[PDB]
Design a protein around this ligand. Sequence first.
Ligand SMILES: *[C@@H]1O[C@H](CO)[C@@H](O[C@@H]2O[C@H](CO)[C@@H](O[C@@H]3O[C@H](CO[C@H]4O[C@H](CO)[C@@H](O)[C@H](O)[C@@H]4O)[C@@H](O)[C@H](O[C@H]4O[C@H](CO)[C@@H](O)[C@H](O)[C@@H]4O)[C@@H]3O)[C@H](O)[C@H]2NC(C)=O)[C@H](O)[C@H]1NC(C)=O
Ligand SMILES: *[C@@H]1O[C@H](CO)[C@@H](O[C@@H]2O[C@H](CO)[C@@H](O[C@@H]3O[C@H](CO[C@H]4O[C@H](CO)[C@@H](O)[C@H](O)[C@@H]4O)[C@@H](O)[C@H](O[C@H]4O[C@H](CO)[C@@H](O)[C@H](O)[C@@H]4O)[C@@H]3O)[C@H](O)[C@H]2NC(C)=O)[C@H](O)[C@H]1NC(C)=O
Ligand SMILES: *[C@@H]1O[C@H](CO)[C@@H](O[C@@H]2O[C@H](CO)[C@@H](O[C@@H]3O[C@H](CO)[C@@H](O)[C@H](O)[C@@H]3O)[C@H](O)[C@H]2NC(C)=O)[C@H](O)[C@H]1NC(C)=O
Ligand SMILES: *[C@@H]1O[C@H](CO)[C@@H](O[C@@H]2O[C@H](CO)[C@@H](O[C@@H]3O[C@H](CO)[C@@H](O)[C@H](O)[C@@H]3O)[C@H](O)[C@H]2NC(C)=O)[C@H](O)[C@H]1NC(C)=O
Ligand SMILES: *[C@@H]1O[C@H](CO)[C@@H](O[C@@H]2O[C@H](CO)[C@@H](O)[C@H](O)[C@H]2NC(C)=O)[C@H](O)[C@H]1NC(C)=O
Ligand SMILES: *[C@@H]1O[C@H](CO)[C@@H](O[C@@H]2O[C@H](CO)[C@@H](O)[C@H](O)[C@H]2NC(C)=O)[C@H](O)[C@H]1NC(C)=O
Ligand SMILES: *[C@@H]1O[C@H](CO)[C@@H](O[C@@H]2O[C@H](CO)[C@@H](O)[C@H](O)[C@H]2NC(C)=O)[C@H](O)[C@H]1NC(C)=O
Ligand SMILES: *[C@@H]1O[C@H](CO)[C@@H](O[C@@H]2O[C@H](CO)[C@@H](O)[C@H](O)[C@H]2NC(C)=O)[C@H](O)[C@H]1NC(C)=O
Ligand SMILES: CC(C)C[C@H](OC(=O)N[C@@H](CCC(=O)O)C(=O)O)C(=O)O
Ligand SMILES: CC(C)C[C@H](OC(=O)N[C@@H](CCC(=O)O)C(=O)O)C(=O)O
Ligand SMILES: *[C@@H]1O[C@H](CO)[C@@H](O)[C@H](O)[C@H]1NC(C)=O
Ligand SMILES: *[C@@H]1O[C@H](CO)[C@@H](O)[C@H](O)[C@H]1NC(C)=O
Ligand SMILES: *[C@@H]1O[C@H](CO)[C@@H](O)[C@H](O)[C@H]1NC(C)=O
Ligand SMILES: *[C@@H]1O[C@H](CO)[C@@H](O)[C@H](O)[C@H]1NC(C)=O
Ligand SMILES: *[C@@H]1O[C@H](CO)[C@@H](O)[C@H](O)[C@H]1NC(C)=O
Ligand SMILES: *[C@@H]1O[C@H](CO)[C@@H](O)[C@H](O)[C@H]1NC(C)=O
Ligand SMILES: [Ca+2]
Ligand SMILES: [Ca+2]
Ligand SMILES: [Cl-]
Ligand SMILES: [Cl-]
Ligand SMILES: [Zn+2]
Ligand SMILES: [Zn+2]
Ligand SMILES: [Zn+2]
Ligand SMILES: [Zn+2]
Lengths: 693, 693
Amino acid sequence: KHNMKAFLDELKAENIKKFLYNFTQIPHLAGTEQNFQLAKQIQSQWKEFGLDSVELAHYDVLLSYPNKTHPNYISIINEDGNEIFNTSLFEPPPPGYENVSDIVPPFSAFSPQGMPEGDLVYVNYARTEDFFKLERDMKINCSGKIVIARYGKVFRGNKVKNAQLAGAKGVILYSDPADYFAPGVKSYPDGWNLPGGGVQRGNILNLNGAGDPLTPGYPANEYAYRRGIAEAVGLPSIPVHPIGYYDAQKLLEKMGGSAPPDSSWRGSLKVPYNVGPGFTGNFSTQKVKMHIHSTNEVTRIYNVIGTLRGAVEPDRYVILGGHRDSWVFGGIDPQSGAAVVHEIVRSFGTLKKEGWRPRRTILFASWDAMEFGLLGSTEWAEENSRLLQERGVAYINADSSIEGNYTLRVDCTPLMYSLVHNLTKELKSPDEGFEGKSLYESWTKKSPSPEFSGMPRISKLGSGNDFEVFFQRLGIASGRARYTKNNKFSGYPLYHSVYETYELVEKFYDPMFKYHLTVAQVRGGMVFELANSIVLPFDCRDYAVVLRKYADKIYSISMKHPQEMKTYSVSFDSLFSAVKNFTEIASKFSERLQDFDKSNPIVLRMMNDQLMFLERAFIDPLGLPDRPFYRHVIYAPSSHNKYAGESFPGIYDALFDIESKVDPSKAWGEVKRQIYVAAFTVQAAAETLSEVA
Amino acid sequence: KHNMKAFLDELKAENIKKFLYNFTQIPHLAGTEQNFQLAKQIQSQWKEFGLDSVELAHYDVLLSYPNKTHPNYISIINEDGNEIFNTSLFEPPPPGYENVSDIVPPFSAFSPQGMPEGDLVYVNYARTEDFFKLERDMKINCSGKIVIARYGKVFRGNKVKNAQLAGAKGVILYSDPADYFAPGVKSYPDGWNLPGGGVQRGNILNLNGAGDPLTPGYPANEYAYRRGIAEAVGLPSIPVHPIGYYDAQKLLEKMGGSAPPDSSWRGSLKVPYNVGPGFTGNFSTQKVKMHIHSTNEVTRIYNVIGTLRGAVEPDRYVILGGHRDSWVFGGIDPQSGAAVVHEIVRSFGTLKKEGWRPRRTILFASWDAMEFGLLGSTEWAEENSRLLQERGVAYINADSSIEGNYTLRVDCTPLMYSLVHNLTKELKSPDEGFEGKSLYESWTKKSPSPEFSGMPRISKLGSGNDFEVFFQRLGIASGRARYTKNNKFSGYPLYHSVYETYELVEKFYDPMFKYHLTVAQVRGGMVFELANSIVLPFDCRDYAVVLRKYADKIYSISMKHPQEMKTYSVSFDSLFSAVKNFTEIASKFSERLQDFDKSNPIVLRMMNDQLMFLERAFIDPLGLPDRPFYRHVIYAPSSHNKYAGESFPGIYDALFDIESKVDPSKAWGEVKRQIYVAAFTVQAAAETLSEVA
Ligand SMILES: *[C@@H]1O[C@H](CO)[C@@H](O[C@@H]2O[C@H](CO)[C@@H](O[C@@H]3O[C@H](CO[C@H]4O[C@H](CO)[C@@H](O)[C@H](O)[C@@H]4O)[C@@H](O)[C@H](O[C@H]4O[C@H](CO)[C@@H](O)[C@H](O)[C@@H]4O)[C@@H]3O)[C@H](O)[C@H]2NC(C)=O)[C@H](O)[C@H]1NC(C)=O
Ligand SMILES: *[C@@H]1O[C@H](CO)[C@@H](O[C@@H]2O[C@H](CO)[C@@H](O[C@@H]3O[C@H](CO[C@H]4O[C@H](CO)[C@@H](O)[C@H](O)[C@@H]4O)[C@@H](O)[C@H](O[C@H]4O[C@H](CO)[C@@H](O)[C@H](O)[C@@H]4O)[C@@H]3O)[C@H](O)[C@H]2NC(C)=O)[C@H](O)[C@H]1NC(C)=O
Ligand SMILES: *[C@@H]1O[C@H](CO)[C@@H](O[C@@H]2O[C@H](CO)[C@@H](O[C@@H]3O[C@H](CO)[C@@H](O)[C@H](O)[C@@H]3O)[C@H](O)[C@H]2NC(C)=O)[C@H](O)[C@H]1NC(C)=O
Ligand SMILES: *[C@@H]1O[C@H](CO)[C@@H](O[C@@H]2O[C@H](CO)[C@@H](O[C@@H]3O[C@H](CO)[C@@H](O)[C@H](O)[C@@H]3O)[C@H](O)[C@H]2NC(C)=O)[C@H](O)[C@H]1NC(C)=O
Ligand SMILES: *[C@@H]1O[C@H](CO)[C@@H](O[C@@H]2O[C@H](CO)[C@@H](O)[C@H](O)[C@H]2NC(C)=O)[C@H](O)[C@H]1NC(C)=O
Ligand SMILES: *[C@@H]1O[C@H](CO)[C@@H](O[C@@H]2O[C@H](CO)[C@@H](O)[C@H](O)[C@H]2NC(C)=O)[C@H](O)[C@H]1NC(C)=O
Ligand SMILES: *[C@@H]1O[C@H](CO)[C@@H](O[C@@H]2O[C@H](CO)[C@@H](O)[C@H](O)[C@H]2NC(C)=O)[C@H](O)[C@H]1NC(C)=O
Ligand SMILES: *[C@@H]1O[C@H](CO)[C@@H](O[C@@H]2O[C@H](CO)[C@@H](O)[C@H](O)[C@H]2NC(C)=O)[C@H](O)[C@H]1NC(C)=O
Ligand SMILES: CC(C)C[C@H](OC(=O)N[C@@H](CCC(=O)O)C(=O)O)C(=O)O
Ligand SMILES: CC(C)C[C@H](OC(=O)N[C@@H](CCC(=O)O)C(=O)O)C(=O)O
Ligand SMILES: *[C@@H]1O[C@H](CO)[C@@H](O)[C@H](O)[C@H]1NC(C)=O
Ligand SMILES: *[C@@H]1O[C@H](CO)[C@@H](O)[C@H](O)[C@H]1NC(C)=O
Ligand SMILES: *[C@@H]1O[C@H](CO)[C@@H](O)[C@H](O)[C@H]1NC(C)=O
Ligand SMILES: *[C@@H]1O[C@H](CO)[C@@H](O)[C@H](O)[C@H]1NC(C)=O
Ligand SMILES: *[C@@H]1O[C@H](CO)[C@@H](O)[C@H](O)[C@H]1NC(C)=O
Ligand SMILES: *[C@@H]1O[C@H](CO)[C@@H](O)[C@H](O)[C@H]1NC(C)=O
Ligand SMILES: [Ca+2]
Ligand SMILES: [Ca+2]
Ligand SMILES: [Cl-]
Ligand SMILES: [Cl-]
Ligand SMILES: [Zn+2]
Ligand SMILES: [Zn+2]
Ligand SMILES: [Zn+2]
Ligand SMILES: [Zn+2]
């Protein structure tokens, strides 16, 4: 028969391996001819696999590229202005790729041009708390200095934003072996570690969900009216460039001024990690000079959108999407995910060719220009927002399938917790020592929930991936899953480097492609259940549990300030009342969902609509403060780290560093305003689960 | 049987008359005990009539009242500071009401306090073009002057906004007999004209859809966090007061300075209508002094919300709503509408008691605090926005049922044109000379469409009534209907005066209550069809026709500036393309709606959802420029006159007075941006009518 087991059994590790090889032989940088060619290939193959339609959706968006005849680099210059040390112009290419054309050299996408020259300040990971330590405790002023920061811990766009606000005139990002070289493992090509010449590419935008910098709110189509560069969203104001640790060692070794304040500031290089400013006495007249000549350029991008029409509810969409554009070869990022999507499409198409169709419509997406700011998914969702908000059931992301080989990682809305627990109990574990055991069992053992015994850890969705528009802007239930390591925001060692190749994966991560297969089963199984279950597989009671946990958490933060809560009458009573009400109403809804007349399709679809619109109810059309495209009131990307999720973000940001605000009455008034918005939104969402009339 | 005819036949003129008498014996000012008592009475009666539930929804909103022991008035003061003339402290009460307590004296709600003294400038109707004429052509400066303006033509809030921007330090509004005294008719109590002591009350806010000034975006519930007065939405900055024409004649008769520029500036009083500033030579040292002592006060208001649960689609809502609060007795406004709603509820409840239920849920609303800025409907819609935007089928308004006795007036979304034409062909005309003819026939004869032969006029929805939140904020198809005169924005002569009584209606407007009955049939018949028709009674092809008319119109405005359109490459091609596409897709959708398998409830409800969400598709979540709660891209209230609808408002406002802008490149860039937003929105709405997968 045509059930989930038939779907799952059709998935093959050997097919995923073949597809991954096929997708990783040449670079597929967004906006380049080779990435358009791959888009056309995937369009062709998805049609052959059996989808009902497969179209390209193109947009013309702002991208950024180095100047091929005017290379980016950093120098140490002496008092005469001679450049006595230069950083590399390219990463040494890996074995057998030393003749591959069009490898983009390391750069920070969207850096402005400039040639700033000055003294170096070392800022650790350039986190908000690193800058607090420098300015408030150490009394070091970054104004007009070049800051050097190690990658890791937070999104690099937040590092650059923090450096700008500190007054820096340039930023140098580098990979420290403390964060990108695991002890006892060899550098690529002999292991999975970053060599000293390796460099992490990546954009440094602060888009806050806007998509293309020139067209916030609206798709970058053929008649779009663009902002000028000066009014564009999210662009950095100071030049930025990434380097590897051989080059970093040359810039850091001469540093003087203050000692590092403690050991959490010291990486693994044989240097003092002095904060500066500038170099020790003998070299005190030498300076650092950046030379950045990259250009921003409106460029065409192509999403591939495949449709498998539903038999019963064709106007309900379950979406499986992941990106296709890569920095270089994309051996892990994104092609390990794209190969998994390809095999899922192939498996669904096999069932379709035998006469089966899912209950609801499945959409498959191959997004472009993700690496330049989630641009392809966001423009597409801007174009199709009315269809998505009235018809969108769920979005399952499909970027990198592996970032390690230890255990499963899932991040998703609470609405999908039960779905994920149930699916993983039915899947086989691929782990050594768990032969014959469920994936649920291995996952729960290796990654225990911090809160509940016998349950696995499932994280909040953060951001930095293509689910952002669907979840935080539009309010469509979203999830992601991949295999992971036993630091989660720093990336694996070869992240966004030229060394991320097919060989990396086949030799060191997943030789038998069994972890890829497991991830294909999780992502595909989730899509299958969402698109085929008669009642949508969402449990509203799980949202009630987490809402109470988040309310306790935010209350606890506020309670660090008892005097102010007294003075300004700051009560969380309304939020706890709303959460209590949500808990009560969700319980009664669950009872009706279990008990309703199962022969009545209108009550069923009424109740499926209540399930589908529950995530939608947490959207506030006015957005969060100064972040209009982050509209979900329960979850937003952290204002300090785009990759991390923050709960009750409006209240969290109102409380953050409140003791430093010059007008406490105004600051605590804003805390109270955010408590009111959150209590109202939770009650309003609860009331969508009440009897409808 | 239980069909529309049974519903319509149960409606009785004599019941409407009894209810109107019952609702108009004492004042029902918002926030007063007598209006809470009436709310409780209507709640009780709607339960007795047979509704499934009837609840009060209360909010605590900013209202405004005169100070009972410190009366508002205006003076002419001489050089010594003696007050030689004072305007009235109250309207002479009508016969038999001279002992009624709690008649609020004439005032402008939300005026700040003050006692400004200065010279008078007469500004005609205080329209944007009146101020253009004064400043640009006549070179008269209103800065630090008190302006005197006649009511009429535009909403009084726009007059006050215009006066503020001209630099005025106070505004006096008065009713000129040119606008409020029809030739050959007697003053009340002997006819329907305004006496010289009559005065029009009314708020002077500029809320732009925000609702309660202190809580924009969120319901004014028990834990709401309020803006301070200084950050409140829409409050005027200068004192304002209304007077009658006996008092106006005393203020105007002494005016000097410039002659009126032409006859359109002269009303019917025996005065020169000199523009000023100030008085003629002999009285040149006399000035005008206002004394305004009204206070703004957060006050509880009560909406009555009645539910008649649908038998088949209980999660789809058809809403019939109108206000209950009045300035004084509300003989026309709103009780002629409220009495009609009461009888409609009674008729639906009679069918319900015999075992019938409508297909979809009907909600009935008695809104409070409408007169203070549509506050009750807007707060309720803010509280329930998630339910309304996913479930709201249509909103039918029910304010005043009569404003004359000549013919029918309908204003509605194009989606309801066909519904209204069909319903009125089935109803009897109440007009003399049309005995035995349809309402459609009498209406079409008396009010011909300017565009099509054999069709009646149907206007755009403007604003200034309780449909605003549902249509312009939320995008729910809305309509209104009343009997009208053969100047439509000025109001009938006794509008918002103490003379608007039950006797006014029974003696002079509708002695046999036949026009009230006809309006009950139109409003009730519309609700019946919307709540019971298997396929929703919306015709998308009618939107396509009007979109082309509005695109031609806005193109024509731009084409007054051919040189600039060349210089800045301003093309409407994308808008016309979108409208052409909408026309094509709507035609194909109509074909499918006629042809789809009529046995398939999922295709039906899929197609009913496409019909329901079509109005919703014209909403832009970012709102219009500086007016975040006006979100519909096709229709907004005119920026110059809240009562009037404007089509393609974003482009219209970008083009308005563009020749006067100091930076034409920036101004024409904004025109192009608005063309892009409108073309995109029309295409996006069209695509909601495409096949779904
Ligand atoms: C969680 O869910 C519960 C319901 O189980 C909600 O309870 C409501 O809570 C508010 C309190 O914040 C109550 O509001 C109070 O209503 C009183 C009148 O209620 C009657 O009349 C209304 C119709 O107008 C009916 O809906 C209702 O059923 C009752 O019959 C007012 O008199 C109260 O105001 C007075 O007291 C307050 C506080 O001291 C003063 O500030 C006022 O000035 C005034 O003197 C008050 O407004 C409401 O009645 C409750 N509804 C119920 C029990 O059905 C929670 O609100 C909800 N949590 C959240 C966050 O929404
Ligand atoms: C009204 O509805 C019609 C459809 O009936 C829409 O027509 C589209 O209009 C745009 C023009 O604005 C067309 O865009 C052009 O697409 C070309 C490629 O199209 C093919 O490939 C795509 C997938 O990527 C398919 O969807 C499509 O079916 C085709 O197979 C591009 O090559 C064009 O770009 C080139 O020309 C322009 C103009 O000179 C240059 O600026 C570019 O730099 C470039 O050289 C262009 O982008 C689109 O193909 C049309 N779709 C159709 C016919 O299906 C209207 O857009 C719509 N009106 C509105 C307002 O939306
Ligand atoms: C994940 O799997 C669990 C375990 O199977 C699912 O929970 C179970 O769901 C079924 C079907 O709704 C429940 O059965 C029902 O029970 C009620 C009351 O006893 C009865 O009236 C109904 O007729 C029906 O038999 C079952 O109780 C429930 N078990 C639990 C909660 O332990 C769960 O739904 C799955 N999650 C999904 C699909 O998201
Ligand atoms: C207002 O009344 C008019 C006139 O009755 C309605 O239009 C008519 O609607 C019916 C029912 O859909 C149409 O009949 C259909 O015709 C097609 C093709 O001929 C056929 O395939 C179907 O089986 C069905 O018989 C009829 O053609 C149409 N007449 C017109 C447009 O002149 C209109 O729907 C009403 N408006 C509403 C309810 O909003
Ligand atoms: C990746 O696989 C695709 C599909 O098998 C290959 O593209 C095909 O190549 C053959 C031979 O050159 C052509 O005849 C077909 O037209 C191509 N098909 C499609 C759908 O594009 C491609 O060669 C493979 N790439 C690599 C690097 O191995
Ligand atoms: C680092 O790179 C710079 C730029 O190429 C080198 O400086 C140049 O050297 C050439 C040849 O001696 C001169 O003609 C250019 O005028 C120099 N340009 C600048 C901008 O200084 C520099 O020699 C390199 N340094 C090292 C250590 O290799
Ligand atoms: C308007 O009509 C209502 C309803 O008939 C009247 O209120 C009733 O009055 C009687 C006698 O005083 C009471 O016994 C009932 O309890 C009232 N019913 C309700 C539902 O309130 C009211 O008197 C009428 N008002 C006027 C001015 O005639
Ligand atoms: C208009 O009203 C004002 C205010 O009541 C009158 O002026 C007052 O007159 C009394 C008695 O003569 C004095 O005690 C007050 O001091 C006056 N107040 C002010 C503010 O001037 C005035 O007489 C009235 N004018 C007319 C023509 O009736
Ligand atoms: C390795 C993870 C921390 C981040 C990784 O995602 C990304 O690399 N995202 C890109 C784009 C992020 C964005 O622009 O939001 C980046 O961080 O440069 C992932 O989710 O797999
Ligand atoms: C007589 C009409 C021009 C206006 C009349 O509506 C109103 O009186 N509305 C009130 C409230 C308007 C508002 O605040 O938007 C007013 O104009 O004062 C109606 O729609 O019947
Ligand atoms: C890149 O650099 C070259 C060589 O210096 C220059 O001629 C060209 O203008 C630059 N390209 C850009 C700005 O796109
Ligand atoms: C840092 O340095 C600059 C002077 O170059 C100054 O504008 C700024 O206020 C300084 N900040 C301090 C001392 O905190
Ligand atoms: C794969 O798993 C083995 C066994 O635990 C481990 O030693 C190795 O480090 C893993 N490879 C990667 C890339 O994590
Ligand atoms: C109204 O005026 C009286 C008498 O002058 C005054 O005592 C009172 O404060 C005022 N009421 C207000 C401001 O509500
Ligand atoms: C009107 O008068 C004031 C001076 O009292 C001045 O500020 C303003 O600029 C004047 N406007 C003109 C002359 O247009
Ligand atoms: C009612 O209709 C008659 C007859 O046309 C007309 O003379 C009279 O003015 C009307 N009354 C009102 C209030 O319009
Ligand atoms: Ca965009
Ligand atoms: Ca509000
Ligand atoms: Cl992912
Ligand atoms: Cl009305
Ligand atoms: Zn990626
Ligand atoms: Zn990446
Ligand atoms: Zn009214
Ligand atoms: Zn009114």
